[PDB]
Amino acid sequence: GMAEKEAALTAAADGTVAALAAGNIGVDYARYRRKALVAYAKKEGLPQAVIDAVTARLDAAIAAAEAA
Amino acid sequence: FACKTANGTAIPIGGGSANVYVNLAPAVNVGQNKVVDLSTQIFCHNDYPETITDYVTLQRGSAYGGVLSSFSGTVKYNGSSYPFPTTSETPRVVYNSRTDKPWPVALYLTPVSSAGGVAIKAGSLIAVLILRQTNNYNSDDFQFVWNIYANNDVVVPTGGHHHH
């Protein structure tokens, strides 16, 4: 169902944040992942609010990695 | 898309160039010398296949570097041979699973001497590989570079002779 796809979106978003904080991806790949995960959410019909929270956590992670 | 070396070291995906440290194990054959078989050195997977399928190709402009800069040869990519330096984009490999898969790449060098060889120090740059990711949800791509570094001291033969 939908919630299974929402759990997959959240897990992939969390893994992207975790990998970026660990330094195992660069910010350019994080932005690629963020864009691709938004496309996944839209094409799978996921609730906008979940896309918004996932995007907000990813944008904060990208901003921190930029700073450092 | 995420990858690791044979000793568990995570290969950073993107950013600047990533430095990948691998063991070179040269082999002399008629008219073609193996430099390094990356399929024993680099293992890749899709960490979140439920969300997106990763398609990865080797891009044109991939070539030897360092003390091997002026040499050409062949790259074996997923069971087919291609000129190296690459002049076209290779076919794609699909990552749709958390299963680690060997990266099906090996580099060969065309003999250009009778018995010569180049000394490779550990920490020497050997090759500069250009990769490209695409996916099944948008038309975007992501290009990134792997600097291949030698992890061992070894002689790379440039001719038809084993070095003892």
Author numbering:
A (entry chain A): 1 to 68
B (entry chain B): 1 to 164
Copy out sentences from the published article reporting this entry, exactly as the authors wrote them.
In this study we show that de novo protein design tools can be employed to design potent and specific minibinder inhibitors of bacterial adhesins, virulence factors critical for colonization and biofilm formation in a broad range of bacterial infections, including UPEC UTI and A. baumannii CAUTI. Among the diverse family of bacterial adhesins, chaperone-usher pathway (CUP) pili adhesins lie at the tips of extracellular fibers, and recognize receptors in a lectin-substrate interaction that mediates host and tissue tropisms. To investigate this, we sought to design minibinders against three CUP adhesins: FimH from Escherichia coli, which accounts for 70–90% of UTIs, and Abp1D and Abp2D from Acinetobacter baumannii, which is prevalent in hospital-acquired CAUTIs and is often multidrug resistant. Being able to specifically target minibinders to the substrate binding epitope using RFdiffusion with hotspot conditioning led to neutralizing binders without the need for antibody screening or knowledge of the native substrates.
Uropathogenic E. coli (UPEC) expresses type 1 pili, a prototypical CUP pilus, which are tipped with the mannose binding adhesin FimH. UPEC FimH is essential for bacterial attachment to the bladder epithelium via mannosylated glycoproteins. FimH consists of an N-terminal mannose-binding lectin domain and a C-terminal pilin domain that attaches to the rest of the pilus. The lectin domain is an allosteric protein that samples a conformational equilibrium between two well-characterized conformational states: a low-affinity state (LAS, also known as the “Tense” state) and a high-affinity state (HAS, also known as the “Relaxed” state). In the LAS, the body of the FimH lectin domain interacts with the pilin domain, fixing it in place, and allosterically disrupts the mannose binding pocket, resulting in a low affinity for mannose. In the HAS, the lectin domain has little to no interaction with the pilin domain, allowing it to rotate freely relative to the pilin domain, and the mannose binding pocket loops are stably positioned to bind to mannose. The mannose binding pocket consists of three mannose-binding loops, two of which remain largely unchanged between the LAS and HAS conformations. The third binding loop, which is known as the “clamp” loop, is dynamic relative to the stable pocket loops in the LAS but attached to them in the HAS, functioning as a molecular latch that stabilizes the pocket when mannose is present and when interactions between the pilin and lectin domains are disrupted under shear force. LAS binders were likely ranked higher by AF2 metrics because the wider binding pocket of the LAS conformation exposed more hydrophobic residues than that of the HAS. The conversion of FimH HAS to LAS by minibinder F7 shows that computational design allows not only the selection of target epitope but also target conformation.
